Amino acid sequence: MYGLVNKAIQDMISKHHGEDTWEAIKQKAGLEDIDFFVGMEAYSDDVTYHLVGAASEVLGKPAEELLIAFGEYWVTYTSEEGYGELLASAGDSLPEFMENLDNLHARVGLSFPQLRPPAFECQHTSSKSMELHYQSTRCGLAPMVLGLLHGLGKRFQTKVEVTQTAFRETGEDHDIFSIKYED
Ligand code: HEM
């Protein structure tokens, strides 16, 4: 994934647990050979998977719980590290935001030529609910989508309730989430 993602992980861990913990996790992840992540440079997806697993071991939290926290953090992080206007342009409510997500990644994709973004599709079931279809080239990030939806929730001052109804992990085609929302 692009370094921006790994910088964000480093930043979340450092701010919440301190630099000493961040150095232990980096060492454990097998990355001592990397002084710093380059935001606009492509890295092997392995770098990120090794960091999550090393953080899970060192911090004693399941990888899935860290991915939910990272998903909320990403909403705030991008807005403060050069992408606030891009975010604002994708809208001012949770559902309109999700409709634009493919289009937001296409814009991100101008500047990150080698991006493999997720694909998201909405089916609106009412003015207060939707089904969200998530398809990805990667495994295991559905829990990250749960935290991102909560970050967008805090962003738009909107109560959100998210329940996953289908799992790529239990053989289903792709992950589907059921979302209820409300001002
Ligand atoms: C301006 C804001 C954002 C920027 C600059 C950005 C950029 C990125 C980048 C660089 C990646 C890594 C992909 C790669 O290296 O191939 C990524 C992945 C991802 N992004 Fe976005 N992103 C933004 C906002 C969001 C938001 C708000 C969501 C909320 C759903 C989201 C959903 C995801 C997911 C689930 C992935 C995991 C990759 C996958 O599933 O295959 N992004 N994004």
Ligand code: NA
């Ligand atoms: Na990576």
Ligand SMILES: [Xe]
């Ligand atoms: Xe992300």
